[PDB]
Motif scaffolding. Structure first.
Motif, PDB file in Angstrom:
ATOM      1  N   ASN A  98       0.864  -1.182   0.000  1.00  0.00           N
ATOM      2  CA  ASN A  98       0.000   0.000   0.000  1.00  0.00           C
ATOM      3  C   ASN A  98       0.899   1.230   0.000  1.00  0.00           C
ATOM      4  O   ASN A  98       1.311   1.725   1.051  1.00  0.00           O
ATOM      5  N   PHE A  99       1.202   1.731  -1.191  1.00  0.00           N
ATOM      6  CA  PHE A  99       2.173   2.809  -1.310  1.00  0.00           C
ATOM      7  C   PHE A  99       1.609   4.144  -0.839  1.00  0.00           C
ATOM      8  O   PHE A  99       2.332   4.907  -0.184  1.00  0.00           O
ATOM      9  N   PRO A 100       0.347   4.477  -1.129  1.00  0.00           N
ATOM     10  CA  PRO A 100      -0.193   5.720  -0.545  1.00  0.00           C
ATOM     11  C   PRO A 100      -0.075   5.738   0.970  1.00  0.00           C
ATOM     12  O   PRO A 100       0.247   6.777   1.559  1.00  0.00           O
ATOM     13  N   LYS A 101      -0.304   4.593   1.615  1.00  0.00           N
ATOM     14  CA  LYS A 101      -0.137   4.508   3.061  1.00  0.00           C
ATOM     15  C   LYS A 101       1.331   4.641   3.450  1.00  0.00           C
ATOM     16  O   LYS A 101       1.659   5.337   4.418  1.00  0.00           O
ATOM     17  N   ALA A 102       2.233   4.023   2.681  1.00  0.00           N
ATOM     18  CA  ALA A 102       3.656   4.117   2.993  1.00  0.00           C
ATOM     19  C   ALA A 102       4.148   5.556   2.914  1.00  0.00           C
ATOM     20  O   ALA A 102       4.968   5.985   3.734  1.00  0.00           O
ATOM     21  N   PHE A 103       3.682   6.311   1.919  1.00  0.00           N
ATOM     22  CA  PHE A 103       4.058   7.717   1.833  1.00  0.00           C
ATOM     23  C   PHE A 103       3.577   8.489   3.054  1.00  0.00           C
ATOM     24  O   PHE A 103       4.296   9.349   3.574  1.00  0.00           O
ATOM     25  N   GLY A 104       2.367   8.189   3.534  1.00  0.00           N
ATOM     26  CA  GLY A 104       1.869   8.850   4.731  1.00  0.00           C
ATOM     27  C   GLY A 104       2.672   8.507   5.973  1.00  0.00           C
ATOM     28  O   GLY A 104       2.900   9.363   6.833  1.00  0.00           O
ATOM     29  N   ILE A 105       3.099   7.250   6.090  1.00  0.00           N
ATOM     30  CA  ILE A 105       3.990   6.862   7.180  1.00  0.00           C
ATOM     31  C   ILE A 105       5.318   7.604   7.065  1.00  0.00           C
ATOM     32  O   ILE A 105       5.837   8.150   8.049  1.00  0.00           O
ATOM     33  N   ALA A 106       5.886   7.638   5.855  1.00  0.00           N
ATOM     34  CA  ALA A 106       7.175   8.291   5.650  1.00  0.00           C
ATOM     35  C   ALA A 106       7.141   9.751   6.083  1.00  0.00           C
ATOM     36  O   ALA A 106       8.125  10.270   6.623  1.00  0.00           O
ATOM     37  N   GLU A 107       6.023  10.439   5.841  1.00  0.00           N
ATOM     38  CA  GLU A 107       5.925  11.839   6.241  1.00  0.00           C
ATOM     39  C   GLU A 107       6.072  12.005   7.746  1.00  0.00           C
ATOM     40  O   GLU A 107       6.479  13.074   8.218  1.00  0.00           O
ATOM     41  N   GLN A 108       5.725  10.974   8.512  1.00  0.00           N
ATOM     42  CA  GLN A 108       5.766  11.026   9.964  1.00  0.00           C
ATOM     43  C   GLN A 108       7.098  10.558  10.536  1.00  0.00           C
ATOM     44  O   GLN A 108       7.357  10.774  11.726  1.00  0.00           O
ATOM     45  N   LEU A 109       7.939   9.909   9.733  1.00  0.00           N
ATOM     46  CA  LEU A 109       9.183   9.350  10.242  1.00  0.00           C
ATOM     47  C   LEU A 109      10.273  10.413  10.265  1.00  0.00           C
ATOM     48  O   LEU A 109      10.506  11.105   9.268  1.00  0.00           O
ATOM     49  N   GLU A 110      10.960  10.515  11.403  1.00  0.00           N
ATOM     50  CA  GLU A 110      11.991  11.529  11.625  1.00  0.00           C
ATOM     51  C   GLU A 110      13.333  11.010  11.101  1.00  0.00           C
ATOM     52  O   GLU A 110      14.236  10.642  11.853  1.00  0.00           O
ATOM     53  N   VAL A 111      13.449  10.993   9.770  1.00  0.00           N
ATOM     54  CA  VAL A 111      14.632  10.486   9.080  1.00  0.00           C
ATOM     55  C   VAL A 111      14.871  11.307   7.813  1.00  0.00           C
ATOM     56  O   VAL A 111      14.028  12.099   7.386  1.00  0.00           O
ATOM     57  N   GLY A 112      16.032  11.097   7.195  1.00  0.00           N
ATOM     58  CA  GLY A 112      16.385  11.777   5.966  1.00  0.00           C
ATOM     59  C   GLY A 112      15.784  11.142   4.732  1.00  0.00           C
ATOM     60  O   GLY A 112      15.268  11.850   3.860  1.00  0.00           O
ATOM     61  N   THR A 113      15.840   9.807   4.654  1.00  0.00           N
ATOM     62  CA  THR A 113      15.386   9.062   3.488  1.00  0.00           C
ATOM     63  C   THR A 113      14.602   7.831   3.918  1.00  0.00           C
ATOM     64  O   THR A 113      15.012   7.115   4.837  1.00  0.00           O
ATOM     65  N   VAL A 114      13.498   7.569   3.223  1.00  0.00           N
ATOM     66  CA  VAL A 114      12.696   6.367   3.413  1.00  0.00           C
ATOM     67  C   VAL A 114      12.720   5.570   2.113  1.00  0.00           C
ATOM     68  O   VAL A 114      12.399   6.111   1.048  1.00  0.00           O
ATOM     69  N   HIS A 115      13.109   4.294   2.200  1.00  0.00           N
ATOM     70  CA  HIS A 115      13.117   3.380   1.059  1.00  0.00           C
ATOM     71  C   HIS A 115      11.919   2.438   1.147  1.00  0.00           C
ATOM     72  O   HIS A 115      11.685   1.818   2.192  1.00  0.00           O
ATOM     73  N   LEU A 116      11.170   2.324   0.051  1.00  0.00           N
ATOM     74  CA  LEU A 116       9.958   1.515   0.010  1.00  0.00           C
ATOM     75  C   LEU A 116      10.275   0.166  -0.624  1.00  0.00           C
ATOM     76  O   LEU A 116      10.769   0.106  -1.757  1.00  0.00           O
TER      77      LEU A 116
END
Lengths: 475, 475, 474, 474
Positions: free
Chosen positions: A413-431
């Motif tokens: 679920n990529f739309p959900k993953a993008f929403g999670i990534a917005e909340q993660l306190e990191v530089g880069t998120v890899h899906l």
């Protein structure tokens, strides 16, 4: 076999009265010696850099790019020679060490071509106020001056070149301080730039003992910019000495891999193991904790276990997956993290063995927040699995870390993953993939204790340049 | 007045147990008091801001911009009321103080529209390696977190808003620490943002005594970014406390005006005197030394002397050109520079006079570089003329300063002036005009001891944002 | 009912002849607009070119201020303008008011986008060492006089989408609205006039295509043509353009590709909303569903139920489905429906026509032999085409002469991105209907769907050129 | 005697009939090139569109590698190629070799520029609050098949200036050189072939204009036309282009404006170098001096002295002034000279013609009633026009139908910048001759001088489009 190495100072190769002998971590073999510079010798390095800056910064971009391409070509030519020594010096797999040198040449070439076509801008006074409509600002890029580049033991060539080439193309001069364990490899890189004809003083090397020159090289007033990769405590110390000078810091990580119920568990397990156990886990960017939803945790853990059991464990010359750690203190630290997790009831899915400083890869399930291994960066081959009940809980635990480098999310679920990534306190998120620095044109940065500044090639060039604005009125 | 001002904390207005009385530097008039906050009250300000951050950074850009535009509208409405008090608080001319408020509204409006249309980027893996051609990076902007904004006494509203608005549009939360002299004006600015409806905790103020909270506000771990304008020694102190936090510094200057043989000498004199003596010389960006080719020095000096003799000297309410300096220590320091110049033989073309802290404007000719006035930043109404015989000498003397903010070049040969500009160690060079920060869309920066970071509106927004990269593989 | 006038050199001009405009849904007489002669067109263009020098020398902030005032006036009068727009083109009343509000949003955004445009400084030393002291200072300039041609289906929104980006850059503008839609265009021009736009900077032209249609375009005073309308008319403008730059916003046949893992209720909701808005009289709109066999029966049932909920009636009652713009348009749609019926398509909802009010028709089992598979109806009819593989869906989609937008409905986003790369369209929407917004996003079509890129910042760049000043530093 | 062949689908191919090419300065037979039929053009285009899918899905890295390889081969063979180019278009031998070297520089620079081009991510919340979770991922794509049409006067440099930017972006290319210049174009193609360019990605077309001239342009396989040549030919391409994007690099009549405070020795040096390079057969070249009365006598004398030192002779001897490209070209220049003389212009150097070798002619006291004031000669003749004010100079400059570049000679830079703003040209050079370089700088012309913006990065941008993928974050 073992050779005496020298520093590059103002176009010449210089010994010092004292030296430091470097031994291979995997075997104890004597590899060679590097100078133990004094503070007066550091003065001479910096004096020559500042004298070279004027003629270097007024060369054309194309002339500076040519030197960099030539040095890259020499690195490719000598990659087997240099990689063989790098392998021994930091107990990196032989093939992986040669690959490090080749990647460095790729970064040098890419930085030369990125930097030479950077542009300035023209701004209109009339954008802001009508009375200034005939006033325009001509804004052009300029170097910051002398860049102190400090490379790490785990990438003594790759994360030296990631600093040197962006700095040089912009018109900066550079002094490279390699880590003692990795100084030979740093000086081998210097040889390539020297053979390429880099003008005297534009690029120099510094080697020595921390107790003699450690603070001195950073506090020196000649230095205009500090660009550092290494441990978080050393990085914090550099910040205290920077004063007004800009700094970049690439420090530690505790990257989370969040695995949701709809994930491809077999592919997640493959990526998690590749990322977590590369170079025995001695990497800041690497999966260091699995946050997995309860419903799939049993199956994910079995998939991870199967692969961990297949990793090769042995010597650098044999291209083992898991090689000996950098030194005894580092291995002691990892053993301590493993004992704390065992003693607090974690399930050891693969067994702990230690031969010298060669630690076999250890996988733990049912890790909880009272265990040191849930939070501390091991820099060794040990991976905890932490079970969560909701995605909200995974985000909360992830962000509770003092580190914030990267994260992986495994889901369909990529739309959900993008929403999670917005909340993660990191530089880069890899899906649906491991965390990683590459490709080297992408931004590389960490939040919180993981560093300061943005690297990746074009970002590093911009970080090490400023602007000069010339303003006039049209008539 | 007996008017007790209050800090804005989480949407509420708060007194403290102790207060600080503020007096007008030109007259001694009691203007009111501001709270003397405790360290625990600073803790509450920062806790409120970090709580507010989560909901603020997730609003749309358009929603954040709407608050800023409304705040600017209120400032325009209250410009006379606010400027009347700012004039008294820092002994700035009444009309100049009102103009400061109007300009602050312009910066706030421009920052809102600049920030809301910032964009991200998408990068291709296949730019760097063929095997990653299906891997792309979606790079979007994010705030840095809590910004500590520290405004200066000489622009306590303009160089507060220059920080607040760029920070807010990007999704940061802000705490404003004004200087004690200038805290009333800072809190008056805060009233406009509160009336515009800025959400509770998104913008707050701190006031108090340096001996109680000075270092504490800067070292607090809640702060993620420090944006400071003020004196060079104070700026250096902040650099020592920044640690890993990014910082921006806007410090002192000693801007040179280089006057060549082909210059329009009447125009040079007009610009020189306007820039050097505005607000009694209490500006970091301001002509502070004339480097003039000897063949036109006699004529230039007479043109400057005529103008300096005509400057009005008096009270802020009367819009005098030269007003009293900010306090007694400042005037003492300026008197000492004048005395050193006189004792070493410089020619006083206008007469030193001091009544209280009101120093009449002093023009010196035949200043030599053994004189303190050739180098030290007075922050008062005194200007040296230094004669040179080559442009190379002028460039050397200019770059010998520890400061590097701006410079002016007066000449009719612009290709030559561009070549000189390239050699000057400054942020901005103005051709046939005085040095100046505007227009506020242009970059504003200083080299060397003049500061760190790039402002101007779009540059200040960039500086107070980071990036978040999300990487995935196309199938 | 009023006698309307063109804005020409700051004054409102009548012509000797005029054209009476009637409401398509009722036949109500709305007023008349001038029928300009070729000599009157010359007078409009002459005023514009005379006004250009002073307008382009203003500062950006001064030009922006005029645009913000015009937007404020449109917001003030949105109900009044929307009420007449709704009658003139049989658009639902509330949708017509929303058009005016959106146009103000676009005008304000273009003002602020255009005023912070920047130039570039390029280094000779990037290319050759001997030129390291040579630099290029590159700044934007207007192109001159822009001819803006608006469409009947968005007579205010897609007039302002041209006028404001043109004006902020320092161009002067002449707006030619379509005859059916001219009143709404002239109501828009009233707001620019009240805002104080200098005389000649913005003007309007109205009249009959047979008298001035070609004349207005081939006139050499025009430096740029910016057109939205039908594909055949657009194609005719491309030939009269000569070497002058043009932008074309033409027809579409947007595909909605529905894969086996899709949320079928969500797909059906978006497909119906997109396909039947404004009775299907939109270039950007789902116009053919390409659904995998396994889910076709369930999707078709869901779409059918939503189509049967659409209201069918008069603009003043905010009906979903309103009467079409004219009898010829309804006749064309009826003929497409009959072709599908005669070739064996399944009518899931039934064809009923009262005047030019056609009920929404949903067809299943449409095949590539039927005209409805390919031709743009500009009416309320939607075909469902079953496919057996994703590859077949991509082939059929790209076989169209149109390439405006596409929707892909699926839960596999990496796969959806790979499909989007292969679709010959400007924009692909994932799990949503096709749409032009938000107006800061690029809007473009491939193949016969047009030329040039719009959306606000792209439109501003299209109607500017550059001026490079090169010199050697000493 | 040498029978050249076209590159088609990775194979070298003759045609049934051929065209023999002769050296313009000497009559030497240089070889033959194929005379393709329309059916052969179809086959070239079919092969290119077939190759497009596999070429556009390579990585940027991989496409860049082919271009660098081709450039390396051009450098290796620069003497061999330049020797033939010199004969084919009667360009000085050394200048011809330098053209090949510059072409390699442009190819390498385009490869590296194009491989790091990026896309944009746009925020819906920039425009409206309700769309704050909607983002647009906007990536660049090729336009498809690019038709490149090179000119005789730069048959390699202004072939590669099209081919390399097109290829790095993922377009496939067909090169149509001019018949005089086709051998040089085919020699360039050899280097791309030896570099390993995949079959059909790059192809060449040669033939007679009467057989394939309009056909190659109207063909619907072509998605983009990139043309350099004469203005009348370029205007004809604009009609045939339809909706398809085009770039046109056409004629010029560049003004050199000399003010009273100018450095006349510098002005004369630059004016003569620019005006008489390649015997004046260049679109970007000073073609009229507009000089203030009070310095005109001295400027004319310093220009005259420099013209008199120009060598007049054969290409193999590196003469400054070489025979013109053909007899009609020389006839046209002779007519302009005769018209100026008959109307009273002063011949500061004298007309002489041997074959098509015309000696350089400098005229003073040229007036606006003379054809030489306005028409592009493409030959070695320069008029001097005296003006009384800078305002008059600007008016006469802008009265030209051409607007490529201009030079301004003066010591007052702020004033020169203000003048440059008023000149209707692409580029203004301060205190230097007009020129296209450096090749990273923009190159463009106003009015009849062309359409589109070249220079390397601009030409890459022109031959790409964008693809927007929009979705909603959850």
């Amino acid at each position: 076999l073992a050779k005496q190495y020298k520093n590059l100072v103002n176009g010449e190769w210089k010994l010092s009265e004292n030296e430091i002998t470097i031994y291979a971590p995997a075997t104890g073999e004597e590899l060679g010696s590097v100078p133990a510079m004094t503070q007066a010798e550091v003065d001479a390095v910096y004096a020559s850099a500042k004298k070279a800056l004027s003629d270097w910064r007024t060369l054309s971009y194309v002339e500076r790019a040519a030197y960099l391409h030539k040095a890259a070509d020499i690195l490719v030519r000598d990659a087997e020679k240099i990689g063989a020594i790098l392998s021994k010096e930091v107990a990196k797999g032989h093939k992986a060490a040669v690959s490090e040198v080749i990647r460095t040449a790729e970064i040098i070439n890419y930085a030369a071509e990125e930097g030479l076509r950077m542009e300035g801008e023209v701004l209109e006074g009339g954008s802001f106020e009508a009375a200034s409509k005939k006033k325009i600002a001509i804004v052009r890029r300029e170097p910051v001056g002398l860049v102190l580049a400090i490379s790490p033991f785990n990438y003594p060539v790759n994360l030296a070149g990631s600093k040197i080439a962006p700095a040089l193309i912009a018109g900066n001069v550079v002094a490279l301080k390699p880590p003692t364990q990795g100084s030979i490899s740093g000086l081998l890189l210097a040889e390539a730039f020297a053979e390429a004809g880099i003008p005297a003083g534009v690029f120099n090397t510094i080697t020595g003992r921390g107790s003699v020159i450690g603070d001195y090289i950073v506090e020196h007033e000649a230095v205009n910019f500090i660009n550092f990769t290494g441990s978080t405590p050393i990085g914090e110390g550099i910040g205290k000495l920077a004063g007004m000078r800009p700094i970049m810091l690439e420090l530690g990580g505790k990257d989370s891999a969040i695995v949701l119920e709809d994930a491809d568990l077999a592919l997640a397990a493959k990526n998690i193991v590749a990322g977590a156990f590369g170079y025995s886990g001695q990497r800041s960017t690497a999966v260091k904790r699995v946050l997995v939803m309860d419903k799939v945790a049993d199956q994910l853990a079995a998939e991870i276990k199967t692969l961990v059991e297949k990793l090769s464990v042995g010597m650098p010359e044999d291209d083992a997956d898991i090689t000996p750690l950098i030194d005894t203190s580092a291995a002691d630290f990892v053993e301590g993290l493993i004992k704390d997790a065992t003693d607090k009831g974690a399930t050891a899915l693969t067994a702990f063995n230690r031969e010298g400083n060669l630690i076999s890869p250890v996988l733990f399930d049912h890790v909880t927040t009272d265990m040191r291994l849930a939070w501390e960066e091991p820099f060794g081959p040990v991976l905890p699995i932490i079970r969560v009940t909701t995605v909200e809980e995974a985000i909360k635990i992830s962000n509770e870390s003092e580190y914030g480098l990267q994260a992986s999310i495994f889901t369909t679920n990529f739309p959900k993953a993008f929403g999670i990534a917005e909340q993660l306190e990191v530089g880069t998120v890899h899906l649906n993939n491991k965390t990683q620095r590459g490709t080297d044109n992408f931004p590389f940065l960490g939040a919180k204790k993981s560093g300061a500044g943005v690297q990746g090639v074009k970002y590093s060039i911009e970080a090490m340049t400023t602007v000069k604005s010339v303003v006039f009125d049209i008539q």
